[PDB]
Amino acid sequence: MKINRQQYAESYGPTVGDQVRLADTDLWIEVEKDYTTYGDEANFGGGKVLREGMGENGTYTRTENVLDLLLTNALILDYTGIYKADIGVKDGYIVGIGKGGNPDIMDGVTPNMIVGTATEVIAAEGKIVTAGGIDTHVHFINPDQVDVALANGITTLFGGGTGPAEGSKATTVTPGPWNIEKMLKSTEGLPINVGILGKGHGSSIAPIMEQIDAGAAGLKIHEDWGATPASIDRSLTVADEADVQVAIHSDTLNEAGFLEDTLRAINGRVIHSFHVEGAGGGHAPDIMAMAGHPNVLPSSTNPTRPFTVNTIDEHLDMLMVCHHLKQNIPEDVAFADSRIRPETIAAEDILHDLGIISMMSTDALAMGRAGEMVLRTWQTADKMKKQRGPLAEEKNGSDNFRAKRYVSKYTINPAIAQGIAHEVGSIEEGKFADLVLWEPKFFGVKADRVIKGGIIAYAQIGDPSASIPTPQPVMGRRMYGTVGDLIHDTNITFMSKSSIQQGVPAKLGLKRRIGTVKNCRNIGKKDMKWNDVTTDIDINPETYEVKVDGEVLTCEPVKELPMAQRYFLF
């Protein structure tokens, strides 16, 4: 008995060699392999396969290789591959990627993926499943920002702030032991993973280190606090001792040094370069040359992503509003023209496409959009396919190479940079079950269901008074993972080893899962999945033209993007 491939894909989702369009982009992903045994596919419903004595095992207790949750028939899109599998979850972690069901009667069942009495079922047939997004440039300004992030598939927020204080409105900084303690307690109520950055500023070690010991997960060096040689040096000395990541927003004004001075202060130590293109901040005009160095883990923030016809007019005025610039102060006009540069924003698109910028991030509510990191990653990949063509590495007419390079920028690479990729950032066995289901039509635009620690936290779902959940209005809503004490078991507070060894969680009464930051100081550019390119980036001081391997990097801004007016009510 045979099924044609159209009916097969309608029933079970696509299989090997089938392609799927990403939303309304030109991007196609191809199923590389499939873990199923054709005819023994798992499915749940009236008269379906996951029933007692059939695809559900009626014998085994939960401890005996039985799952808490099976996602059936998922199309996984991950740095590790684009492929078809069932995903098994237990104790809030991914324990099996393979083939679920009942070894009594089915061939090819992964031995720890038994569906038993204890197993919940999520149907992922016809869905794309990704890791939750890891946003490492978050300003904690307004708690309403969390649902915005969840609705676009973000599951981890790394950054800083105390709410809409000016320090927090400019910088990803929760300063000092008391503010860090207060925000770790606030974090108990946020239905998303969190790590808090301290102030990376001081000329003595102790005022910086005491933030790490208080529960900070890393540091932020920001020009607004003095991105001086001393603050850079002390922060990195603290980070090397504490095993945490340092983010940097460098001295745009070149007040105490040029880029080469900042790099000398860094002295080959590991650092995360935020908004490396520089519209969001940094040494005017050549900060983006940071992305060539082997000790730099470079991220973009999202408003420059990708280069469009409204980008420059929007950014010149955004900078005027953000900085309180006056059009009748020539120094303010010169500053804005030194900072907002079509030459570097255009080159930023191509540096992403080449694997020279490794990471995306938001800059949520400071100079970037909390719900648009995933959205703008795919808009950039789509623009680059249109302007540069399929990458050489591609095969079978698919965009799988470009799709792995781009999904890496907001999943695994930020996790690696932050020292948290042991817990989050990819769909791999042994990692926390932060999973996002997408309808292909909505891929990268609006998440269907966001799973946090193996329970749904957020869902596009309809009328709660209705007979079934699909009637209007369908909107983003918090689910049972966010309610009561379950918000503690489904989310991770990431903290320094020292704060954990010193018992800060018990001191503050933290009930959330505690994640350990580690393995941040022994990494570089070579560790960024699919985005590992080191090269000499030349930025012309007079023309701002960007050159890599003697070749000027330029592209046109586009008048239209996919994943825009087809989808959004405003």
Partner 1 sequence: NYIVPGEYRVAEGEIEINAGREKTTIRVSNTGDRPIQVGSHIHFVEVNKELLFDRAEGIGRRLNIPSGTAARFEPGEEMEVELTELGGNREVFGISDLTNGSVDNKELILQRAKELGYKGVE
Partner 2 sequence: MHLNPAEKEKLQIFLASELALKRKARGLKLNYPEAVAIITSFIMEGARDGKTVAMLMEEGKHVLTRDDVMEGVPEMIDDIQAEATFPDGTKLVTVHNPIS
Give the residues lining the site for partner 2 (CB under 8 A): 24, 144, 147-148, 151-152, 303, 308-311, 313-314, 317-318, 320-321, 369, 371-372, 375-376, 379, 441-442, 446, 460, 462-468, 470-476, 557-561, 563-570
CB of 169 to Ag ion, least distance (A): 9
* Interface map 237-276 toward Ni ion (x if CB under 5 A): ------------x---------------------------
Shortest spacing between CB 272 and ligand [O], in angstroms: 12
Classify strands 218-222 and 193-199 as parallel, antiparallel or unpaired: parallel
**From CA 535, how far away is CA 119, in angstroms rounded?**
50
CA distance 542 to 82: 44
CB of 142 to partner 1, least distance (A): 24
> Any idea how long the chain is?
570
- The response to whether 139 counts as a known ligand-binding position is yes
In angstroms, what is the minimal distance from the CB of 379 to partner 1? 14
Among the listed residues 373, 437, 379, 359, the one whose alpha carbon sits nearest the alpha carbon of residue 128? 437
Instruction: Tell me, yes or no, if 323 is annotated catalytic.
Output: yes
Report the site for ligand [O] in 316-345 (rule: CB under 6 A).
none
If one asks whether residue 281 binds ligand [O] (CB under 6 A), the answer comes out as yes
Tell me how far, at minimum, the Cβ of 521 lies from Ag ion, in Å.
30
Query: d(Cα 217, Cα 222) in Å, to the nearest integer?
Result: 16
42 is in an annotated binding site: no
Could you tell which of Ni ion, partner 2, a copy of itself, none binds residue 164, using a CB distance below 5 to 8 A set by kind? Answer: a copy of itself
Backbone φ/ψ region at 40: left (φ over 0), alpha (ψ -120 to 50), beta:
alpha
For 507-537, give one letter per residue: b (16+ CB within 10 A) or e.
ebebebbbbbbeebbebebebbbbbbbebeb
156 binds, among partner 2, a copy of itself, ligand [O], none (CB under 5 to 8 A by kind): none
Interface residues with Ag ion (CB under 5 A)? 322-323, 367
3-state class (DSSP) for residue 97: strand
Q: Is 366 annotated as a binding residue?
A: yes
d(CA 232, CA 236): 6
| Residue 280 half-sphere exposure toward CB, CA atoms < 13 A | 31
Residues 238 and 205: beta-carbon distance below 8 Å: yes
**Going residue by residue from 75 to 114, which x/- string records binding to ligand [O], judged by CB under 6 A?**
----------------------------------------
Sign of the CA dihedral with 440 first, then 444, 446, and 452 last: positive
**Least spacing, CB of residue 52 vs partner 1, in Å:** 5
Which range in 44-52, 366-374, 439-447, 527-535 contacts Ni ion by CB under 5 A? 366-374
Shortest spacing between CB 137 and Ag ion, in angstroms: 12
Q: Give Cα 423 distance to the centre of its chain.
A: 13
Nearest of 445, 441, 442, 425 to residue 433 by alpha carbon: 425
| Residue 406 in tokens | 């781009």
How distant is the alpha carbon of residue 557 from its chain centre?
A: 25
Q: How far apart are CA 99 and CA 494, in angstroms?
A: 32
Binding status of residue 546 toward ligand [O] by CB under 6 A: no
Q: Coil, strand, or helix at residue 66?
A: strand
323 binds, among Ag ion, Ni ion, ligand [O], none (CB under 5 to 8 A by kind): Ag ion
- Residue of 272, 323, 352, 488 with catalytic role: 323
- By C-beta, is 73 or 245 nearer to a copy of itself? 73
Residue whose CB is less far from a copy of itself, 15 or 119: 119
Is 352 annotated as a binding-site member?
A: no
Q: Is 251 annotated as a binding residue?
A: no
Of all residues in this chain, which one has the CB nearest to Ni ion in the complex?
249
| Residue at token pair 């009916």 | 7
Would you give the distance in Å from CA 390 to the centre of its chain?
Answer: 24
- The helix/strand/coil state of 334 is helix
Nearest distance from residue 252's CB to a copy of itself, in Å? 7
293 is in an annotated binding site: no
Rounded Cα gap, residues 92 and 455, in angstroms? 8
How far is Cα 196 from Cα 434, in angstroms, rounded to an integer? 19
Q: Which is nearer to a copy of itself, 108 or 163 (CB)?
A: 163
Picked from ligand [O], partner 2, a copy of itself, none, the partner binding residue 76 (CB below 5 to 8 A depending on kind) is: none
Residue type, 329: I
Q: Which of residues 387-446 bind ligand [O] (CB under 6 A)?
A: none
Question: Is 422 labeled as ligand-binding?
Answer: no
Is 363 part of any known ligand binding site?
yes
**Residue 275 annotated as part of some ligand binding site:** yes
Token pair 């995903």 in the structure block, residue = 87
DSSP 91: T
Annotated binding site for Ni(2+): 137, 139, 220, 249, 275, 363
Annotated binding site: 137, 139, 170, 220, 222, 249, 275, 363, 366
Write out the catalytic residue numbers. 323
Residues contributing to the site for ligand [O] (CB under 6 A)? 249, 275, 280-281, 363, 366-367
Residues contributing to the site for Ni ion (CB under 5 A)? 249, 280-281, 363, 366
